[PDB]
Amino acid sequence: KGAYQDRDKPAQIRFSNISAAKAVADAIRTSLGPKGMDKMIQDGKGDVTITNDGATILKQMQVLHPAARMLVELSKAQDIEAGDGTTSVVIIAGSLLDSCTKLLQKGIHPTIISESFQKALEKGIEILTDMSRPVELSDRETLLNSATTSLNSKVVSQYSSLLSPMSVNAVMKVIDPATATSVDLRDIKIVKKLGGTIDDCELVEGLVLTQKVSNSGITRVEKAKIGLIQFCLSAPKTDMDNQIVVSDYAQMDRVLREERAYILNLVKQIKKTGCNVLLIQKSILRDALSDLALHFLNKMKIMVIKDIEREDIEFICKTIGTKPVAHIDQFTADMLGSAELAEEVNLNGSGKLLKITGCASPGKTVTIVVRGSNKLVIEEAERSIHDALCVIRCLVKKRALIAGGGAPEIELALRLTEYSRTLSGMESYCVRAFADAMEVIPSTLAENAGLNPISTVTELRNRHAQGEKTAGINVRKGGISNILEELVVQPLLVSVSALTLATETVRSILKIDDVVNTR
Amino acid sequence: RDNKQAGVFEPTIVKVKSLKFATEAAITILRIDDLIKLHPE
Amino acid sequence: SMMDVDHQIAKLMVELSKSQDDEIGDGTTGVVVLAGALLEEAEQLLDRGIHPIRIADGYEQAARVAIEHLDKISDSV
Amino acid sequence: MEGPLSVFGDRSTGETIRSQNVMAAASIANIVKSSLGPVGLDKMLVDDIGDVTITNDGATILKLLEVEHPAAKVLCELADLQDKEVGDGTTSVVIIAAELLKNADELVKQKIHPTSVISGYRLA
Numbered sequence: 001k002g003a004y005q006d007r008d009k010p011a012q013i014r015f016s017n018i019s020a021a022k023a024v025a026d027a028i029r030t031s032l033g034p035k036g037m038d039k040m041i042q043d044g045k046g047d048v049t050i051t052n053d054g055a056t057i058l059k060q061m062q063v064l065h066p067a068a069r070m071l072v073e074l075s076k077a078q079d080i081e082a083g084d085g086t087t088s089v090v091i092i093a094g095s096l097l098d099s100c101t102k103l104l105q106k107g108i109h110p111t112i113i114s115e116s117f118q119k120a121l122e123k124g125i126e127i128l129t130d131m132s133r134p135v136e137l138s139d140r141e142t143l144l145n146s147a148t149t150s151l152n153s154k155v156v157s158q159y160s161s162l163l164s165p166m167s168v169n170a171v172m173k174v175i176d177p178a179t180a181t182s183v184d185l186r187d188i189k190i191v192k193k194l195g196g197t198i199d200d201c202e203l204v205e206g207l208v209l210t211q212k213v214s215n216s217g218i219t220r221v222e223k224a225k226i227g228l229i230q231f232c233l234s235a236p237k238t239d240m241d242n243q244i245v246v247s248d249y250a251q252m253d254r255v256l257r258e259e260r261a262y263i264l265n266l267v268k269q270i271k272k273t274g275c276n277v278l279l280i281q282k283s284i285l286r287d288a289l290s291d292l293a294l295h296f297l298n299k300m301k302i303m304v305i306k307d308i309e310r311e312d313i314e315f316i317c318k319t320i321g322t323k324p325v326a327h328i329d330q331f332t333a334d335m336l337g338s339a340e341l342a343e344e345v346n347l348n349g350s351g352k353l354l355k356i357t358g359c360a361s362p363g364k365t366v367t368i369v370v371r372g373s374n375k376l377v378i379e380e381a382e383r384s385i386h387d388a389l390c391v392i393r394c395l396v397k398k399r400a401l402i403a404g405g406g407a408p409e410i411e412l413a414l415r416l417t418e419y420s421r422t423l424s425g426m427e428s429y430c431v432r433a434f435a436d437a438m439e440v441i442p443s444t445l446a447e448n449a450g451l452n453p454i455s456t457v458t459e460l461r462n463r464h465a466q467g468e469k470t471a472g473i474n475v476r477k478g479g480i481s482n483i484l485e486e487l488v489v490q491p492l493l494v495s496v497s498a499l500t501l502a503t504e505t506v507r508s509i510l511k512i513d514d515v516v517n518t519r
Numbered sequence: 520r521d522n523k524q525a526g527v528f529e530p531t532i533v534k535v536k537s538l539k540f541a542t543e544a545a546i547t548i549l550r551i552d553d554l555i556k557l558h559p560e
Numbered sequence: 561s562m563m564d565v566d567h568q569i570a571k572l573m574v575e576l577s578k579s580q581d582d583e584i585g586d587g588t589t590g591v592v593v594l595a596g597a598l599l600e601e602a603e604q605l606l607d608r609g610i611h612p613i614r615i616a617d618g619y620e621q622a623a624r625v626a627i628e629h630l631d632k633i634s635d636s637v
Numbered sequence: 638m639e640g641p642l643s644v645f646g647d648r649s650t651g652e653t654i655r656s657q658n659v660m661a662a663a664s665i666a667n668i669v670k671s672s673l674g675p676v677g678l679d680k681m682l683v684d685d686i687g688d689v690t691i692t693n694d695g696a697t698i699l700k701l702l703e704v705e706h707p708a709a710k711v712l713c714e715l716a717d718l719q720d721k722e723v724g725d726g727t728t729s730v731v732i733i734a735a736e737l738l739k740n741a742d743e744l745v746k747q748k749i750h751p752t753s754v755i756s757g758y759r760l761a
């Protein structure tokens with residue numbers, strides 16, 4: 001007879017948290033893998049969203065249980081660190097907790113479960129690293145295969161032939177492949193424009209803008225010199241309160257004339273540089289482009305795009321080599337950007353786009369125009385392309401590759417079962433639970449593919465025991481096979497981060513024993 | 520009836536775009552296997 | 561029996577315990593604990609994707625085995 | 638809610654939601670089926686105030702209607718897109734999308750995987 005444990009509310013709270021987490025995992029289990037399908041989510045306001053992304057799904061369904069909220073945060077963290085695996089991580093967490101259920105019932109302490117899970121996690125990171133193979137960023141075929149694998153799960157998979165080379169080109173265009181240790185995907189701009197179909201998506205090396213051109217008649221410019229204008233082309237206005245007191249009839253005409261002359265001098269100093277395209281920043285508190293200024297620019301044959309946003313300035317400069325000018329005195333030729341063409345293109349009556357293509361200083365920036373027949377499919381195409389970019393980012397960060405099709409999970413299950421048999425004690429039960437929990441991804445992949453999950457997962461375990469550690473679920477043949485022949489590869493970072501973050505979240509949830517309702 | 524001799528013509532773009540858009544719509548709707556309708560606030 | 565249950569499966573479990581009491585007069589708690597455990601294990605089996613009828617048939621087979629083993633290890637007074 | 642998933646809303650899953658989506662699309666297409674071809678006829682539309690609109694244009698009809706289901710709003714926007722990019726075919730495109738949905742859901746009921754149906758539709 002040990003300690004009576006006079007209180008049962010800690011156990012009730014643990015079981016409620018485990019149940020909520022397992023419920024979330026089982027709710028999103030259907031959106032896992034190439035044969036997985038999407039969920040539609042209608043917000044309270046009525047905003048519809050179709051998606052296969054685990055992070056998006058979890059953020060959009062307003063889960064209420066604390067454990068479910070924590071799983072949402074977990075998926076968001078995985079989306080940050082790897083951008084791919086946001087469903088696998090939640091499923092792994094739910095499964096580990098579902099195993100904590102039977103462990104707790106067996107009568108193991110949550111602290112022992114947590115420590116044994118940390119042990120199993122370290123051993124599993126070891127195992128996955130052993131499985132991994134190095135990759136060279138020059139291996140364009142390996143990059144294409146990683147991107148295609150990442151896209152196989154999404155609605156944009158019939159267009160993979162189009163969107164994988166774009167998703168690899170963008171990243172290889174926005175990084176120096178020899179020195180890069182990461183990539184900032186804010187350098188990759190995505191522009192969603194309704195109309196056409198997803199096969200109409202494009203990778204624009206130059207610049208794309210949704211702002212409209214103010215000139216009528218000047219839509220196309222070749223050999224374009226472009227200038228950014230952070231000052232206002234309108235009547236003078238001091239930063240102090242200013243008035244112009246008229247006391248004689250002559251002063252009225254004089255005021256109008258001097259205003260005209262000010263504006264004309266401005267636009268003439270602009271023309272004198274050879275500038276034929278003029279990007280004007282957006283200006284509240286003062287008119288950035290008066291009618292006189294527009295008249296004069298048009299007469300001088302200059303295309304004008306105003307209302308540029310103060311956040312697109314760094315992007316536009318990074319793209320087309322311009323330097324932002326805030327005083328007309330400093331507006332010279334060295335502050336311009338040279339572009340072989342700048343045109344306002346129409347998209348089959350579905351809107352207009354300003355495309356600045358060709359650049360003498362195309363500095364590590366690219367744009368992707370996402371087309372589509374519906375807002376929903378456009379949004380999910382954007383999300384999938386982002387997932388592919390993040391997969392390439394993982395590959396850049398950690399130059400290591402792991403097989404797919406549930407091969408890493410199966411190898412993990414197997415080797416951690418062995419580790420458990422070697423770690424005799426009460427840690428053995430917990431490590432075996434960790435292994436059988438990691439066995440849920442292959443089961444889910446099989447179920448979604450339409451196979452018999454038990455037989456499929458047993459065949460996988462058997463072949464991995466024989467030694468085919470690169471063996472997985474071939475949804476094309478309908479059974480098990482060497483998955484590298486199907487070219488299903490993913491960065492080691494995805495699996496490693498998924499395992500690490502899921503284990504940390506599980507230990508956190510296991511360290512909880514009560515719930516209070518504040519206020 | 521021979522509609523080319525009867526004069527019943529449609530621009531190719533009509534049928535082509537109709538097919539492409541209809542297929543895209545069918546694909547997007549068919550990809551949905553779940554629905555979560557949140558209670559408004 | 562004193563429990564004011566609304567769930568129909570809980571009503572089935574009440575009937576199960578009452579049946580054990582009618583037939584035997586003892587074991588009314590063992591039957592319920594064991595049935596709950598069997599269903600809890602069927603839960604994990606269903607997660608792995610086995611047909612619930614296959615689960616029920618495996619349970620019937622194992623129950624026959626256990627009954628025969630009871631007859632085997634039994635003693636007499 | 639009653640289920641373990643504590644989301645504050647309703648949840649449809651599987652053949653239920655697939656049949657519902659197909660029902661919505663079919664509803665939208667059956668609205669406009671009667672206005673197709675040289676023998677199609679026009680429709681009145683009354684805007685709850687006595688505002689009357691006579692029309693044969695499927696895009697116009699689906700813009701004037703007040704649709705609540707998202708799988709039917711999808712087809713309404715499809716007709717709008719057809720009107721923007723082509724200018725004709727706004728009814729045929731909706732009819733064809735709905736029929737593709739019908740047959741594809743029939744296949745999914747026969748348990749052909751929706752990915753396979755989608756690949757076949759893309760190829761076709």
Ligand SMILES: Nc1ncnc2c1ncn2[C@@H]1O[C@H](COP(=O)(O)OP(=O)(O)O)[C@@H](O)[C@H]1O
Binds near residue numbers: 033084085404473474
């Ligand atoms: N063509 C394929 N064949 C077999 N398995 C695949 C294929 N494409 C992807 N997978 C598997 O599907 C998983 C990716 O599913 P996904 O929907 O992206 O979930 P997550 O977002 O959690 O990665 C990976 O574990 C990968 O092994």
Ligand SMILES: Nc1ncnc2c1ncn2[C@@H]1O[C@H](COP(=O)(O)OP(=O)(O)O)[C@@H](O)[C@H]1O
Binds near residue numbers: 585586587588589590
């Ligand atoms: N003195 C004892 N030592 C060990 N086990 C016992 C003892 N008395 C009863 N048990 C066990 O307790 C279990 C539960 O029986 P109990 O709950 O008393 O009756 P019921 O199950 O009909 O309510 C029985 O399986 C029996 O083997």
Ligand SMILES: Nc1ncnc2c1ncn2[C@@H]1O[C@H](COP(=O)(O)OP(=O)(O)O)[C@@H](O)[C@H]1O
Binds near residue numbers: 677726
């Ligand atoms: N004179 C005709 N004889 C036979 N079919 C016709 C004739 N005119 C039009 N059609 C058919 O009617 C269909 C669409 O009719 P309509 O409703 O006017 O166009 P929309 O699809 O733009 O609504 C087309 O597929 C076309 O083949």
Ligand SMILES: [Mg+2]
Binds near residue numbers: 150387
């Ligand atoms: Mg993925």
Ligand SMILES: [Mg+2]
Binds near residue numbers: 586587
């Ligand atoms: Mg007794």
Ligand SMILES: [Mg+2]
Binds near residue numbers: 725726727
């Ligand atoms: Mg017509």
